[PDB]
Nucleic acid binder design. Structure first.
Lengths: 150, 94, 91, 25, 96, 127, 200, 226
RNA sequence: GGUGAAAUUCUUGGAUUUAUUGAAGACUAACUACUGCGAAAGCAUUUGCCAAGGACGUUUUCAUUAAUCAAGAACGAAAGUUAGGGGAUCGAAGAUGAUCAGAUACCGUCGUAGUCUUAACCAUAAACUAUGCCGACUAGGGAUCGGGUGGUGUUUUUUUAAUGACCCACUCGGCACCUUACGAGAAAUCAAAGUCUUUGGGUUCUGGGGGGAGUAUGGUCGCAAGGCUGAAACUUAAAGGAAUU
């Protein structure tokens, strides 16, 4: 694995077999849904909403507690970001290296990493354009990348 | 044909190390490739301590020892008899 | 449309003065005629005036610097050393 | 000959051929 | 972070951009916090602090320039000072 | 009740130095060496010549007034040998056996912290 | 006639109600509207004119005075600076490395401008055509074009004359030579290409 | 080579130890047995004199001789002559240096060498660069024979070592510092403060070399040599 | 001073050596390892700042967005080139001392370019693990690096809480290693170089006897040195690989 590196480590989450869980949960489906949008209203990305609901609340995963997923709930209630979250962080990282490479120009390691990040962004953007998430004419512009991250 | 699994000497996973210089003929050799022998010999020669002790101020108790690490090239180590050739079976011995 | 592929700015000299001298004067003239930005305003408006003088058209603040560069690397290192010495002595 | 010395010899010979070449072309 | 907090405020609460609008907000007392970039003229900054002290508001300094302040806000142009009319869904008023 | 000095026995190849010095280090007594006793130019650093050289350094010091000295045996140091000379240990025994008591032997050979370069090239002193 | 830009810094006369205008050589980083603090108790800032007797070692200075009350002696060319090496408490004297590379010892009450003279790197672009050189020298003096002495008549130059173009005698001229024979290298200790370190 | 020199004098008798006088050295009151030794010097003449030529001198002695005991042999104290009193030159503390035998003895392999230094000025305006050394140790019941560190404990102990040295030097004079290094109490302080990060062993301070000397102050010297 | 031995060379103008310092540049011993990181080249003093990366932990999120690659692009040891700074040791050239029948080679003493750095080029190596990348399975054993888990485990501060450092057991990713040879190979040898005449997991590149020859020419890149692509005529029955005596 490791699309852009030589690593081969395996590490992920092992979800339980119980699609109806965690039994001891007692809160209602609507109670967690309004909690999801409340956390989404304060700028939290879907990953952080799940992280906060998993360690602070009794919500193991928002798929078995609710009828849909976190991003699905956000889109339904109207709190869906314009650009995908994973692409948003990738572009945010890309402009960080560009900011680093605009002052310390002699960093060839950053240049190689910047090319890897830009290639990763383009590959992810191609899938999103194909899946009809981004505009068909969407492109990664280095000058406009900083403005896209807002 | 191939002779040793470690081709030059003790280098698997690095690719390059800072070289060192031989103490005998000043030959440039990789630090791993160099054969190192540590010298723990006393500052005085063999015996002669009893001569020093009689002419020693304070109750002796000094007996200093010099410590030095010596790096030898392959040509010099074999020539100086420090490192000698072995049979194929004895080659694998560490 | 890339009228000149390698000559660049110094196509005025033509075929005279030698390729090496043309390359050096091109390298320095690119920075001499480049447009810089004010550190007092941020707009890219700093342009070269006379030798060592860099004046602008929006903020009108003039800076003394290099003959062809708005900030010499040696000057930047000297300023950094001066700031370090001042911080060490005034602490 | 060694590979280095043979390559150096043919490189010097190539330099001489190119120097002769520059006189006509 | 401060950039994320400003972006959240721009997305949710009421914000105004520029110097004259900031002065007007300070005059009308509809302002709570003002953020001034480290590149604005010192005279303008000092007058902004005077208005802020007269109106009992909060002053924050953005450690960049007008370009950086505009980028953090989420605008292409240059912003020298941003006045925060309403916090909205963020917490930049209560914290920092 | 015993005045003290310093031996500074410089031990190297092709030469050997025994230079008795007072406690401070400015004074110099009996700088005789092993090269002014031998007539071969190959035994100047030999142990047989260091003993002869140190036999005079222990007599001039005694005549001067020095009865005991400290010992700081050193080598060429730098980036050349870093090992004591063949006759350095013989010179120490020579003045010890001449009635001059010694004490507090020290090794003061200059070890470098990776300074400059060593003569010989990258292919060594091919002989 | 000078490659270093000038800065017009005006002060206030402490004894009379009148504005004094002073002409200072502009340093790198100095901008219009900047406040320059000239004196002894100032701060170590670019453009300040503190004396060399109250600055830490390693200080980069410009417009260094050879003696107190000189108003600018050393480091007055573009891109040049003077390095502070050390100070002597007793018999106050500051040691300075000059742009030439010659060690100097001056008084501790010699004022110097902090920073690097503007216009640095001026001599890095060939004059390309004779017109640029002519314009540069017209504003300076009548020293261009220069005619070689070996192409002259024997009466108009010692090196001239003969059926060929050769000096004839040695180009090196002794220091104790009268006016007229000093045409070439004056007191040249060494000649030829300078290969290796200069042993400065 | 007694008969190989060709050019002995390119230009074209009395024994020199008759014009030399013995001078007895003395040490600070920090060291118990002052009793330093004797040194030669040219006789006092009207051109150069003996005081001027003896004013600048640094004599190196061993701490074991000064203190009488034997557990300070590996530490040699360097004393600098700076003033005389009529055939008894008086010295002052100039530096401390760990002998080559000891330094190369504690330095072994299969262990981590922790080193640090600090530039600190004392109360009497003596700018001092103080070095310290430390080696990781194999704790009891451990079977792994490398006892290495993770380069983060090294930085932590280096920070603790630096602040400990700064604390015990800033707030004391040169005489107090000299009276502090001899009992080796600084080593106890370090082993008390860096014992919760990594065991360590052979905690020592390497060099206390001098960098800047303040005004001569002949008054302090007379207090040193009572 | 140096060498197997000598000599050039330095020495009443004090060489060499010792003691107190100062300046300049280079470098990062000992600690330094069948040890770590990085795509490779490569990277070893301390501190501060900047961004980046692998592994681990995860009941967090997207969801097949993936693997290999013509063309194309980034980095790319040393040496070399352009213009400054720097220039202490070593040191292509060169000058001498020898040895030798001859020695402009090995050895000795000097010594320019270079070795360091800034900005722009050069795109090469035994750049090797001579072994392309991704994925699956297959004999055991121990040590070690990074993360995690458990054991009233041991030690540590205030004997005894935490934490940290160690012991034992387990787990994931590593640099690797020891013994066997199911299996493979011409053999040397290999946990892959195995699961290939019981021949088929996906993909890229290269080779068709030895010379001529990586030469000639034609393109292409480069300031140059040189890099990439790249023959033919002609000649030969042999070269070449692993092992045995």
């Amino acid at each position: 694995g490791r699309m852009h590196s030589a690593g081969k480590g395996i590490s992920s989450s092992a979800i339980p077999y119980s699609r109806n869980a965690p039994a001891w949960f007692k809160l209602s489906s609507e109670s967690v849904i309004e909690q999801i949008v409340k956390y989404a209203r304060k700028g939290l990305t879907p990953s952080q909403i799940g992280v906060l609901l998993r360690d602070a609340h009794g919500v193991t995963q928002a798929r078995v507690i609710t009828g849909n997923k976190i991003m699905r709930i956000l889109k339904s209630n109207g709190l869906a970001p314009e650009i995908p979250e994973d692409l948003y962080y990738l572009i945010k990282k890309a402009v960080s290296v560009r900011k680093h490479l605009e002052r310390n120009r002699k960093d060839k390691d950053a240049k190689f990493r910047l090319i890897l990040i830009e290639s990763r962004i383009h590959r992810l953007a191609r899938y999103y354009r194909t899946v009809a998430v981004l505009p068909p004419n969407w492109k990664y512009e280095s000058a406009t990348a900083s403005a896209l991250v807002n | 044909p191939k002779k040793r699994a470690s081709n030059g000497r003790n280098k698997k996973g690095r690719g390059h190390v800072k070289p060192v210089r031989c103490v005998n003929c000043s030959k440039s050799i990789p630090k791993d490739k160099a054969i190192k022998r540590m010298a723990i010999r006393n500052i005085v020669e063999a015996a002669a301590v009893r001569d020093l002790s009689e002419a020693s101020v304070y109750p002796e108790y000094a007996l200093p020892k010099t410590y030095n690490k010596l790096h030898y090239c392959v040509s010099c180590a074999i020539h100086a008899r420090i490192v000698r050739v072995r049979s194929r079976e004895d080659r694998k011995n560490r | 449309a890339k009228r000149t592929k390698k000559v660049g700015i110094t196509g005025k000299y033509g075929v005279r003065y030698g390729s090496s001298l043309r390359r050096q004067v091109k390298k320095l003239e690119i920075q001499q005629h480049a447009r810089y930005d004010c550190s007092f305003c941020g707009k890219k408006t700093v342009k070269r005036g006379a030798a060592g003088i860099w004046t602008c058209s929006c903020c009108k603040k003039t800076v003394a610097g290099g003959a062809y560069t708005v900030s010499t690397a040696a000057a930047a290192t000297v300023r950094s050393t001066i700031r370090r010495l001042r911080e060490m002595v005034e602490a | 000959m060694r590979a280095k010395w043979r390559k150096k010899r043919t490189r010097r010979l190539k330099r001489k051929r190119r120097k002769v070449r520059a006189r006509s072309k | 972070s401060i950039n994320q907090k400003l972006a959240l405020v721009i997305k949710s609460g009421k914000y105004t951009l520029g110097y004259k609008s900031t002065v007007k907000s300070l005059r009308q007392g509809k302002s709570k916090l003002i953020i001034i970039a480290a590149n604005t003229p010192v005279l303008r900054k000092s007058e902004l602090e005077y208005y802020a002290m007269l109106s009992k508001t909060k002053v924050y300094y953005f450690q960049g320039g007008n370009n950086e302040l505009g980028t953090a806000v989420g605008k292409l142009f240059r912003v020298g000072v941003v006045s925060i009319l309403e916090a909205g869904d963020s917490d930049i008023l209560t914290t920092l | 009740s015993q005045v003290f000095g310093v031996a500074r026995i410089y031990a190297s190849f092709n030469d050997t130095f025994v230079h008795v010095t007072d406690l401070s280090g400015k004074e110099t007594i009996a700088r005789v060496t092993g090269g002014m006793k031998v007539k071969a130019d190959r035994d100047e650093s030999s142990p047989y010549a260091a003993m002869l050289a140190a036999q005079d350094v222990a007599a001039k010091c005694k005549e001067v007034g020095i009865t005991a000295v400290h010992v700081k045996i050193r080598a060429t140091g730098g980036t050349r040998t870093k090992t004591p000379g063949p006759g350095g240990q013989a010179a120490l025994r020579a003045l010890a056996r001449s009635g001059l008591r010694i004490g507090r032997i020290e090794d003061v050979t200059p070890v470098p912290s990776d300074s400059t370069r060593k003569k010989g090239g990258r292919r060594g002193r091919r002989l | 006639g000078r490659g270093a830009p000038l800065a017009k810094v005006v002060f206030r006369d402490p004894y009379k109600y009148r504005l004094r205008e002073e002409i200072f050589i502009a340093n790198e980083g100095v901008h219009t509207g900047q406040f320059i603090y000239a004196g002894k108790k100032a701060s170590l800032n670019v453009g300040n004119v503190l004396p060399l007797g109250s600055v830490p070692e390693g200080t980069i200075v410009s417009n260094v005075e050879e003696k107190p009350g000189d108003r600018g002696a050393l480091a007055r060319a573009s891109g040049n600076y003077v390095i502070i090496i050390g100070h002597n408490p007793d018999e106050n004297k500051t040691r300075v490395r000059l742009p030439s590379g010659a060690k100097k010892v001056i008084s501790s009450d010699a004022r110097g401008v902090i920073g690097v003279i503007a216009g640095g790197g001026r001599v890095d672009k060939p004059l390309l055509k004779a017109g640029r050189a002519f314009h540069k020298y017209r504003l300076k003096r009548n020293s261009w074009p220069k005619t070689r002495g070996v192409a002259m008549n024997p009466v108009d130059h010692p090196h001239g004359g003969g059926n060929h173009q050769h000096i004839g005698k040695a180009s090196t001229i002794s220091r104790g030579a009268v006016s007229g024979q000093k045409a070439g290298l004056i007191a040249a200790r060494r000649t030829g290409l300078l290969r290796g370190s200069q042993k400065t | 080579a007694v008969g190989k020199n060709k050019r002995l004098s390119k230009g074209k008798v009395v024994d020199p130890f008759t014009r030399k006088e013995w001078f007895d050295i003395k040490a600070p009151s920090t060291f118990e047995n002052r009793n330093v030794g004797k040194t030669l010097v040219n006789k006092s003449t009207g051109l150069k004199s003996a005081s001027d030529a003896l004013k600048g001198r640094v004599v190196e002695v061993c701490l074991a001789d000064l203190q009488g005991s034997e557990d300070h042999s590996f530490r040699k104290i360097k004393l600098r002559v700076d003033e005389v009193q009529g055939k008894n030159l008086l010295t002052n503390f100039h530096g401390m240096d760990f002998t080559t035998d000891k330094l190369r003895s504690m330095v072994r392999k299969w262990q981590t060498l922790i080193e640090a230094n600090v530039t600190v000025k004392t109360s009497d305006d003596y700018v001092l660069r103080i070095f310290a050394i430390a080696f990781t140790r194999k704790q009891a019941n451990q079977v792994k024979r490398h006892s290495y560190a993770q380069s983060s404990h090294i930085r932590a102990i280096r920070k603790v070592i630096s602040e400990i040295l700064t604390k015990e030097v800033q707030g004391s004079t040169l005489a107090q510092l000299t009276s502090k290094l001899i009992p080796e109490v600084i080593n106890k302080e370090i082993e008390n403060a860096t014992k919760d990060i990594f065991p360590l062993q052979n905690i020592h301070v390497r060099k206390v070399k001098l960098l800047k000397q303040p005004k001569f102050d002949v008054g302090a010297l007379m207090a040193l040599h009572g």
